[PDB]
Design a protein around this nucleic acid. Structure first.
Length: 183
DNA sequence: TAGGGTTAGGG
């Protein structure tokens, strides 16, 4: 059995009217639900506008994500891979982005090294292996842009990534200003 | 639109 964290989707933008039951009614169309909850304010019981659904397998999660866009109780909602409580504290953890930062890549890394690891996650649009503009020296990191934000979301929730023979660190790309704001 | 009484003892 796969870990609960990887079987779970965050569902944002729920209608006020959505309950555990109507959410379940919709998302069971793509597999067995082991968990399904709408988050509510404890005192007022009013919906917080989001919840979670958990499938019995990650394959069912993939099937649900392939069926976007999802309309639940008359509202288009925003399903996202569930980011752990720990990781949710990091700058940019919940951004909707198509680009990843790939850190700690060998100096002799070439585009094909990145394709041979990342193409299995989604359609690649742009690969940029970064060099210093003045010196031409390799800087040890790259950016990869995909055609679907879910490709990025599914990558960054995994721990290890092997490029050009060795582990690298993969994070959602923060803009120049976001990087400054995160410092 | 980021979590449900779900996060650092006591030796």
């Amino acid at each position: 059995k796969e870990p609960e964290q990887l079987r779970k989707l965050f569902i944002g933008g729920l209608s006020f009217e959505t309950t555990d039951e109507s959410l379940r009614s919709h998302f069971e169309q793509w597999g067995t639900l082991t968990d399904c909850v709408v988050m509510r304010d404890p005192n007022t019981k009013r919906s917080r506008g989001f919840g979670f659904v958990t499938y019995a397998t990650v394959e069912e999660v993939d099937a649900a994500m392939n069926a976007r866009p999802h309309k639940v109780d008359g509202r288009v909602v925003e399903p996202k891979r569930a980011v752990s409580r720990e990781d949710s504290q990091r700058p940019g953890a919940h951004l909707t982005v198509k680009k990843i930062f790939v850190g700690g890549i060998k100096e002799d890394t070439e585009e094909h090294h990145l394709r041979d690891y990342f193409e299995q996650y989604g359609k690649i649009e742009v690969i940029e292996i970064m060099t210093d503009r003045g010196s031409g020296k390799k800087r040890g990191f790259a950016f990869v842009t995909f055609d679907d934000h879910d490709s990025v979301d599914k990558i960054v929730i995994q721990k290890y990534h092997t490029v050009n023979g060795h582990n690298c660190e993969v994070r959602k790309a923060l803009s120049k200003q976001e990087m400054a704001s995160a410092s």
